[PDB]
Amino acid sequence: MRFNHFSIVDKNFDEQLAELDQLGFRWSVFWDEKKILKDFLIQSPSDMTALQATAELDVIEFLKSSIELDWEIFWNIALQLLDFVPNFDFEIGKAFEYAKNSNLPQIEAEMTTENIISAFYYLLCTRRKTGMILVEHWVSEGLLPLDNHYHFFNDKSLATFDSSLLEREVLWVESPVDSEQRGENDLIKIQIIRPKSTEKLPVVMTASPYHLGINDKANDLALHDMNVELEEKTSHEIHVEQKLPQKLSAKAKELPIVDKAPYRFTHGWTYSLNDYFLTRGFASIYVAGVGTRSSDGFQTSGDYQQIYSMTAVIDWLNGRARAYTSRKKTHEIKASWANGKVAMTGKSYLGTMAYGAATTGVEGLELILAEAGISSWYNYYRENGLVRSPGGFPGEDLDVLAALTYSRNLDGADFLKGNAEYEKRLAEMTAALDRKSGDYNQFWHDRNYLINTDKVKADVLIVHGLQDWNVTPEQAYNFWKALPEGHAKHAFLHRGAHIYMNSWQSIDFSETINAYFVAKLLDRDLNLNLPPVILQENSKDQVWTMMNDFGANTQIKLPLGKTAVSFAQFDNNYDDETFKKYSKDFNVFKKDLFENKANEAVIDLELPSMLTINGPVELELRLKLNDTKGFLSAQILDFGQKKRLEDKVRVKDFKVLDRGRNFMLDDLVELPLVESPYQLVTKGFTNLQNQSLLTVSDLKADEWFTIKFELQPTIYHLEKADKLRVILYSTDFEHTVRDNRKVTYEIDLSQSKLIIPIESVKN
Amino acid sequence: MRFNHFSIVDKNFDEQLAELDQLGFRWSVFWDEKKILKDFLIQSPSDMTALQATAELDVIEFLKSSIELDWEIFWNIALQLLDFVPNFDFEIGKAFEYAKNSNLPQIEAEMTTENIISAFYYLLCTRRKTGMILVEHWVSEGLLPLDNHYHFFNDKSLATFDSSLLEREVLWVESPVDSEQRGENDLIKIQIIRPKSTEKLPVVMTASPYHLGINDKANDLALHDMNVELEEKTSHEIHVEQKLPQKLSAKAKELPIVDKAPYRFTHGWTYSLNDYFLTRGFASIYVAGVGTRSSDGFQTSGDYQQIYSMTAVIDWLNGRARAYTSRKKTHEIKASWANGKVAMTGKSYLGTMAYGAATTGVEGLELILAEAGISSWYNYYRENGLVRSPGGFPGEDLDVLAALTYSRNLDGADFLKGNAEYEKRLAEMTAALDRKSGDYNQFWHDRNYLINTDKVKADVLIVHGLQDWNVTPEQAYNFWKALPEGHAKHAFLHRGAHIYMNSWQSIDFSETINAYFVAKLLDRDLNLNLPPVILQENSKDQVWTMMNDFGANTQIKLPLGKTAVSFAQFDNNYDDETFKKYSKDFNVFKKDLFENKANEAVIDLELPSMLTINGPVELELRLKLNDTKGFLSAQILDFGQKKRLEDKVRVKDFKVLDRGRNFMLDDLVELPLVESPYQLVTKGFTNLQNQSLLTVSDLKADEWFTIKFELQPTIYHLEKADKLRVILYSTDFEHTVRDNRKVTYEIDLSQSKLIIPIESVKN
């Protein structure tokens, strides 16, 4: 196995001794090393009598013997404390080497009392085989009491807050939006989970429109039919201007103020990362926003009205907004328990709200941890003037999502009063989507946060899977690039798909975030020094590395032509039998597509030297077709039998992650390295009539022309022997419209090039 | 969706009113029905303002209106309380019908105050769509306080015990066994989890050798090679006698007695069913037994020494055995908090310990809930004088399991002191297994609990999957049949494989067990009337029914011959290329086998009339082969495209099952009904030299002979149009040894019959 640590903060010896002292390890520099070892074991929750010290002695016998401590014996014992099984996982007497091969943090210096003290200090910061760093594992076993006070170790907050004393309250924040123009402010319900504390508490907020329930039936009924014809566009230029929603201010009111919230709740969805923080002194707040269960308004899905319905919570936490005990607005409640500092978490739609909220510059929002989020809704349901369904979900669009998350209709009483207004507004949204052209427009522009990144003041932490074709990498890439120069930002890019990564064995993600959260939300110094991007290497088992940026400046060019006279063509139309079996199951189409058994142009490129792709690949193509309309599709896969990481996790151990003290037990998981015949590196699409998103032009039939479009950005490393399978085609029975007209594409490969941004590395 | 209830206990009106009163619903027979409805909603944790009463009014408006209550309005509201979404899951105004089609308990009588009161009473006993009965759902939301006192409703214990006050203690019970003959009693470590209570507490014990860890490496290394030759047997008769282990008594000792256990623990594996009971006033005790981590002895795996190491715990709970605070035996501890009543739970090895423990007749052991358990170890690793690996695990045997569960070696300090003795005893076990003949012997006889069922005094509840080929149905079937006449016994047979069934949406299993457990462990009357067997119907979605017995007396006979001159033959030997690809992956072999693409004899039988198989199928065959040794294999599958239940569960909802108050949240799951080309009904194997397990006979080559052997028992219903695919063959690359010698089998189909026990049903 292999470990990777990014959460270990370097500390001086005096600092180390002081922190150890706080944990009950009161040592001095002139103590004997075996005495320090003995005290370390005795003061801990571990069972000394079960530990083996050497090939011939257990720990007790070793302590009684005259044999002196060396690094091998130290590691024999340390690995056992880290949950490794001696004689089976590792060889007693070769523990030092085993630790080295596992990439565990190790002190490499002479055996002295001072060096031994540091080895123990950092051992406490080290991940166990079962997913938790030693110190937290021991804390969960009783090392420290549950006193509901902050206790820090290596700049991390420990789980010293009693989860049995958590308060679960409900209240409505008065937002400055009127999504349905009723002439009143929309009240937004929020759920609060906070530990007991004698001091103001930071907040970890998750804005989830899914939180209070989902409407699957309405979702399936709104689903769009992909089996339609591709409409031709007229030469024209698209014009847009940015206009932010006007904040509505509620009048003055002399209402009485209550101390505690009268309404409470017990069950609710939670993000395991938020739970981890609850016992570490961080309250959680979940908001569903406008158009959701128990709240007012329409499900404006993505625009700034929804963003403001969420950020109102932050205003309330900072005493800049009003909250009531109920929707009757008879009593007001204040955030007397909060310090006003906030951090947003969650993936997908939740990460999307974090990006959006960040672009408002709201004070108090200190940082966002946006995972698999959307920075511009247009790219989630479209691509270069084309209708492009999210990976795995054909027929989906913003109106289908609106129907899914308009949870107000989940309550019969609410359905009765607001269903009419809802359908009216959903129909208006559906027409605004313009699935006919698939072009960018004002409606989409109002859901593009990239144009407001200049207002971002919060630190930005981005998490994104490089095999996530649902919420494409461009989403993270674009926000990353639009952020002003010198802005505090970091990205974690893994190889999974649309999944979380806070329960993995290969990286100390939660512990790293812990350090970052305490510094930003508790007003402390951030001693943690993280690189620009933390990347999980492809074709490697549990290997993580660091990069300087996402998107390199250097680039090499590979011609698609193998000769000076190389032409390639393929049809758009399939036989009616094959066309209908591809439309019924896009997975069979993908299989054939990848194996060159469908209408396509395949180019197998032998790689010159090893290289690391870092950024969006560009496709410069010279083609022609016998029609005045059409689009092009392209997929690039790492072709050939080889071990590669799957995009779906596998379980390592069940319920070994304790988010407190027998609180929300979680499983330890990890992406498996398995042999595959190939793997998708990146893909992209473009409407041949869209030279750019804003300009549509006429297309001339039977005439040669050249197009330049980028594919999804990514970071992928290839060896000099690997092969890149470039697939060019039209209809994609998973993303684009399915038009079966008789058209023929012809590509001049010798005039076609593949531009690839590569990590210079300065190897 | 469809629900099935077996936990609802019938109660008189006076009883109903009294129980409702205890929940805070203080009603009288002369109250108006709308007033009762109003009080019911107001006194509950539900949100009245979100509920819809009619197609035009919400509940509040309905209460204010003059419209009277009828059964349709009642169900409109009841379905919402049961978590169904009005207007989407069901049609407002047609709620009564929807409830009927979902098989929900319904009162069918005139609308009166008395009938309305009963409808509410039983509504509280009814399962919600999300997996919990209404009353328990509301209790988890605060309907009743956490007072650590027993509260009963419809004969079920409610979750009124505070999980935050659970005590987790460790101690060692002095067993009466000396598995390694050291001249001392083996101390057995136990983990106790008990809620706070002012009265003696029943106990729910789980004997799990896996509990404290498993040794996967040792498991893989002990794995046996299946690619070996089949040895011929000599005519002889096997002789066995039953001899129980002599209980060793520890001498007297004047040790001081402590009040509370000094040793404690925090983390540990638990069975969700046991957790469910913790908050309902039932303590949990987990034991790993002899040869496990922190306990003395060898891993005797299955014999009565291991059984006694577990039952010693029950003796201690009843003041008949000594327990110490530590292995130093300096202080004694007594079970002052226990009432002495015990119930055993768990599946597989754990269910096996329950069967075994039951055959000892130990006082205090009131009942066992044995799931997928083994009643005789021989059948788990053998079948009719043949080595037959557990389904899915080729090469496994008792010694491989011993290596897996000898968890004492997981501690380095223990490895040092007892590894030598361990390997010595494991080698002795391996030789005793006699994989050469595969015959029954004394070693196996000492691990056969079926011969001691006359000593069973505890009620017996059996749970077993009819698609579990790991731990075959014969295990449950045999114990069921050996139980003395009139003995209290019940069986739940589902269609899953080696899985649990206490978190399903289609059956109220936990609630049924709740009622059974309180009556038996708390000395109360058992008013619950359960049928002999609760069976989940095949080829049906969420349908459960009841049967009078497992194994019918009636039987029909189907000839395998389609004509008077019908012969069939097949080889044993395959080409060396095919033989090695089948040995590397038995799944490809099974695929070919089922699709008649391997060396086999297939008989497609058209069924005359519909029928329900109930018991073991018998195969009377007349065959011959050119050899003096060999075995026969047979599999019978329900052939043909049709919707069938898979043997693996699918998730319905995440974390909706609360085992307390935000305690051990669990997912609601269910076996999915999907279309399949076929499905295995039953299979069996036999050594042609074994007329019976105890008599081995010589085999004559090129000579006709007839054999009669049974396949695995089961209950499967077939329609008159279904087809039974009977497959006869030799080598099974999943269960039996892989001998590729050149032999030819010939079967006389006209002299061969299929005897099938059928449920008379008296249709």
| Whether the Cβ atoms of residue A450 and residue A478 lie closer than 8 Å to each other | yes
User: Is B412 in contact with A58 (Cβ distance < 8 A)?
Assistant: yes
Residues 6+ apart with CB under 8 A from A254: none
- Report helix, strand or coil for B168: strand
User: Is B88 in contact with A215 (Cβ distance < 8 A)?
Assistant: yes
Question: What DSSP state is assigned to residue B201?
Answer: E
Q: Which CATH class is domain A214-225+373-447?
A: mainly alpha
Task: Give the best residue of B46, B58, B132, B294 to mutate against chain A (max A CB count within 10 A).
Answer: B58
Q: Which residues of A are catalytic?
A: 348, 468, 498
Give, for B283, the enclosing helix (H) or strand (E): strand B283-287
> Strand B338-347 to strand B156-157: parallel, antiparallel, or no bridges (unpaired)?
unpaired
Experimental method: X-ray
Nearest to A415 among B52, B142, B410 (CB): B52
Q: Which two tokens stand for residue B626?
A: 């050119």
Please say whether the structural domain A226-238+549-639+678-759 has been given the CATH code 3.40.50.720.
no
Calculate how close chain B gets to A165, using CA atoms only, in Å.
10
| Whether the Cβ atoms of residue A676 and residue A436 lie closer than 8 Å to each other | no
CA torsion angle for B434, B440, B446, B451 (degrees, to 10)? 170
Integer Cα distance of A630 and B465 in angstroms: 55
Please say whether the structural domain B166-213+239-372+448-548+640-677 has been given the CATH code 3.40.50.1360.
no
User: Is A413 in contact with B56 (Cβ distance < 8 A)?
Assistant: no
CB atoms within 10 A of CB B288: 27
Calculate how close chain B gets to A164, using CA atoms only, in Å.
6
Question: How far is residue B176 from each of residues A632, B307, B361, measured CA to CA in Å?
Answer: 79, 11, 16
Residues 6+ apart with CB under 8 A from B623: B632, B704, B705, B706, B707, B745, B746, B747, B748, B752
Calculate how close chain B gets to A312, using CA atoms only, in Å.
24
Question: How far is residue B623 from each of residues B159, B552, B632, measured CA to CA in Å?
Answer: 62, 28, 10
Residues 6+ apart with CB under 8 A from B415: A52, A86, A87, B408, B409
Task: Give the best residue of B81, B87, B165, B189 to mutate against chain A (max A CB count within 10 A).
Answer: B87
Instruction: Return residues 743-762 of A near B (CB < 8 Å).
Output: none
Integer Cα distance of B28 and B26 in angstroms: 7
| B414 in A contact zone (CB under 8 Å) | yes
| Whether the Cβ atoms of residue A277 and residue A518 lie closer than 8 Å to each other | no
User: Is B266 in contact with A50 (Cβ distance < 8 A)?
Assistant: no
Question: How far is residue B249 from each of residues A52, B299, B317, measured CA to CA in Å?
Answer: 33, 20, 17
| Whether the Cβ atoms of residue B447 and residue B379 lie closer than 8 Å to each other | no
Convert A344-371 into a string of H (helix), E (strand) and C (coil). Answer: EEEECHHHHHHHHHHCCCCCCEEEEEEE
| Whether the Cβ atoms of residue B184 and residue B329 lie closer than 8 Å to each other | no
Integer Cα distance of B663 and B637 in angstroms: 43
- Residue among B4, B64, B67, B20 nearest B38 (CA): B64
Across B688-749, the runs of DSSP E, i.e. the strands, are 695-696, 705-710, 714-718, 723-729, 744-748
For chain B, the farthest-separated pair of C-alpha atoms sits apart, in whole angstroms, at 91
Task: Determine the residue of chain B that is closest to A215 in CA distance.
Answer: B88
Task: Determine the residue of chain A that is closest to B416 in CA distance.
Answer: A56
Residues 6+ apart with CB under 8 A from B699: B627, B628, B629, B630, B688, B689, B705
Calculate how close chain A gets to B228, using CA atoms only, in Å.
28
| Whether the Cβ atoms of residue B279 and residue B659 lie closer than 8 Å to each other | yes
| A63 in B contact zone (CB under 8 Å) | no
Integer Cα distance of B346 and B536 in angstroms: 20
| Whether the Cβ atoms of residue B53 and residue A416 lie closer than 8 Å to each other | no
- Residue among A387, A466, A431, A730 nearest A579 (CA): A730
- Residue among B152, B193, B231, B238 nearest B741 (CA): B231
Residues 6+ apart with CB under 8 A from A19: A11, A121, A152, A153, A154
CA torsion angle for A579, A581, A585, A589 (degrees, to 10)? -60
| A198 in B contact zone (CB under 8 Å) | no
Task: Determine the residue of chain A that is closest to B220 in CA distance.
Answer: A88
User: Is A217 in contact with B294 (Cβ distance < 8 A)?
Assistant: no
> Strand A533-536 to strand A544-547: parallel, antiparallel, or no bridges (unpaired)?
antiparallel
Within 13 A of A410's CA, how many CA atoms are on the CB side? 24
Q: What share of chain A is helix, strand, coil (3-state, %, to 5)?
A: 25, 25, 50
Residues 6+ apart with CB under 8 A from A64: none
| B140 in A contact zone (CB under 8 Å) | yes
Integer Cα distance of B462 and B354 in angstroms: 10
Integer Cα distance of A20 and A138 in angstroms: 13
Q: Which two tokens stand for residue A74?
A: 């130290």
Segments in A25-172 forming alpha helices (H):
33-42, 59-64, 71-81, 95-101, 113-125, 134-140
Q: Which two tokens stand for residue A439?
A: 């072009």
Integer Cα distance of B124 and B133 in angstroms: 7
User: Is A88 in contact with B49 (Cβ distance < 8 A)?
Assistant: no
| Whether the Cβ atoms of residue B203 and residue B317 lie closer than 8 Å to each other | yes
Integer Cα distance of A558 and A604 in angstroms: 11
Sign of CA dihedral A22, A27, A29, A34: negative
| Whether the Cβ atoms of residue B160 and residue B150 lie closer than 8 Å to each other | yes
Instruction: Return residues 552-581 of A near B (CB < 8 Å).
Output: none
Task: Determine the residue of chain A that is closest to B165 in CA distance.
Answer: A164
Packed helices A304-317 and A349-358: angle between N→C axes, nearest 10 degrees: 70
User: Is A414 in contact with B294 (Cβ distance < 8 A)?
Assistant: no
| Whether the Cβ atoms of residue B208 and residue B295 lie closer than 8 Å to each other | no
Chain B residues whose beta carbon lies within 8 Å of the beta carbon of residue A59: 413
User: Is B49 in contact with A140 (Cβ distance < 8 A)?
Assistant: no
Q: State the Rg of chain B over Cα.
A: 29
Residues 6+ apart with CB under 8 A from B172: B187, B188, B189, B190, B295, B323, B324, B325, B326, B327
Chain B residues whose beta carbon lies within 8 Å of the beta carbon of residue A413: 49-52, 58-60
Instruction: Return residues 284-313 of A near B (CB < 8 Å).
Output: 294
Sign of CA dihedral B547, B551, B555, B561: positive
User: Is B412 in contact with A49 (Cβ distance < 8 A)?
Assistant: no
- Which string of b and e fits A352-384 if b means at least 16 CB within 10 Å? bbbbbbbbbebebbbbbbbbbbbbbbbbbbbbb
Integer Cα distance of B551 and A458 in angstroms: 70
| A416 in B contact zone (CB under 8 Å) | yes
Q: Which two tokens stand for residue B131?
A: 């997996």
Integer Cα distance of A506 and A512 in angstroms: 13
CB atoms within 10 A of CB A758: 18
Sequence-separated contacts (24+) of A442-447 with Cβ below 8 Å = A442/A240, A442/A241, A444/A376, A444/A377, A444/A378, A444/A382, A445/A240, A445/A241, A445/A242, A446/A242, A446/A243, A446/A303, A446/A304, A447/A301, A447/A302, A447/A303, A447/A376, A447/A377, A447/A378, A447/A398
- Residue among A279, A280, A42 nearest A153 (CA): A280
Calculate how close chain B gets to A209, using CA atoms only, in Å.
17
Instruction: Return residues 64-123 of A near B (CB < 8 Å).
Output: 76, 80, 85-89, 92
Task: Determine the residue of chain A that is closest to B76 in CA distance.
Answer: A412
Integer Cα distance of A97 and A49 in angstroms: 25
Calculate how close chain A gets to B99, using CA atoms only, in Å.
17
| B662 in A contact zone (CB under 8 Å) | yes
Integer Cα distance of B470 and B499 in angstroms: 11
- Report helix, strand or coil for A615: strand
| Whether the Cβ atoms of residue B291 and residue B298 lie closer than 8 Å to each other | yes
B248: burial class by Cβ within 10 Å (0-12, 13-18, 19+)? Answer: middle
Chain A residues whose beta carbon lies within 8 Å of the beta carbon of residue B217: 85, 88-89
CB atoms within 10 A of CB B564: 6
- Report helix, strand or coil for B260: coil
Nearest to A50 among B86, B141, B413 (CB): B413
Which is the catalytic residue, given B178, B397, B399, B468?
B468
Sign of CA dihedral A325, A329, A333, A338: positive
Integer Cα distance of B113 and A485 in angstroms: 74
Q: Which two tokens stand for residue A243?
A: 């206009």
Task: Give the best residue of B264, B411, B652 to mutate against chain A (max A CB count within 10 A).
Answer: B411
Q: Which residue has the tokens 């999804």?
A: A712
Integer Cα distance of A467 and A471 in angstroms: 10
Calculate the CA A526 to chain-centre distance.
Answer: 22
B22: burial class by Cβ within 10 Å (0-12, 13-18, 19+)? Answer: middle
Residues 6+ apart with CB under 8 A from B516: B367, B459, B461, B526, B528, B530
Integer Cα distance of A288 and A213 in angstroms: 10
> Strand A365-371 to strand A236-237: parallel, antiparallel, or no bridges (unpaired)?
unpaired
Integer Cα distance of B662 and B664 in angstroms: 7
Question: How far is residue B431 from each of residues B306, B424, B426, B553, measured CA to CA in Å?
Answer: 20, 11, 9, 41
User: Is A412 in contact with B56 (Cβ distance < 8 A)?
Assistant: no
Phi and psi, residue B531, nearest 5°: -75, 165
| Whether the Cβ atoms of residue B705 and residue B622 lie closer than 8 Å to each other | yes
Q: What is the residue type of B624?
A: K
Calculate the CA B10 to chain-centre distance.
Answer: 27
Q: Which residue has the tokens 């949990």?
A: B284
| B149 in A contact zone (CB under 8 Å) | no
Q: What is the residue type of B738?
A: R
CB atoms within 10 A of CB B531: 14
Integer Cα distance of A100 and A439 in angstroms: 55
Chain A residues whose beta carbon lies within 8 Å of the beta carbon of residue B416: 52, 56-58
| Whether the Cβ atoms of residue B595 and residue B635 lie closer than 8 Å to each other | no
In the annotation, is B224 catalytic?
A: no
| Whether the Cβ atoms of residue B441 and residue B240 lie closer than 8 Å to each other | yes
Calculate the CA A736 to chain-centre distance.
Answer: 25
DSSP string, B630-693: -EEEEEEEEEEEEEEE-SS-EEEEEEEE-SSSS-S-EEEEE--EEEEEEEEEEEEEEETTBSSS
Q: Which two tokens stand for residue B198?
A: 């002012």
Segments in A52-112 forming alpha helices (H):
59-64, 71-81, 95-101
Integer Cα distance of B200 and B521 in angstroms: 11
Question: How far is residue B233 from each of residues A189, B385, B629, B630, B710, measured CA to CA in Å?
Answer: 78, 10, 8, 10, 22
Return the domain boundaries, chain B.
Answer: 12-165, 166-213+239-372+448-548+640-677, 214-225+373-447, 226-238+549-639+678-759
Integer Cα distance of A300 and B193 in angstroms: 50
- Residue among B680, B616, B669, B609 nearest B644 (CA): B680
Calculate how close chain A gets to B1, using CA atoms only, in Å.
15
- Residue among B743, B739, B741 nearest B227 (CA): B739
| A218 in B contact zone (CB under 8 Å) | yes
Q: Which two tokens stand for residue A272?
A: 């395991």
CB atoms within 10 A of CB B184: 14
- Residue among B108, B121, B715 nearest B466 (CA): B715
Residues 6+ apart with CB under 8 A from B108: none
| A412 in B contact zone (CB under 8 Å) | yes
| Whether the Cβ atoms of residue B233 and residue B696 lie closer than 8 Å to each other | yes
Q: Which two tokens stand for residue B731?
A: 């080598």
Integer Cα distance of B128 and B508 in angstroms: 10
User: Is B49 in contact with A413 (Cβ distance < 8 A)?
Assistant: yes
Per this entry, what is the length of chain A? Answer: 763
Question: What DSSP state is assigned to residue A212?
Answer: T
- Paired with B118 in beta bridges are none
In angstroms, what is the resolution? 2.2
**Pairs across A and B, CB distance < 8 A:** 99
- Paired with A687 in beta bridges are A631
Question: What DSSP state is assigned to residue B163?
Answer: G
Number of H helices, E strands in chain B: 19, 31
Q: Which residue has the tokens 């091998």?
A: A72
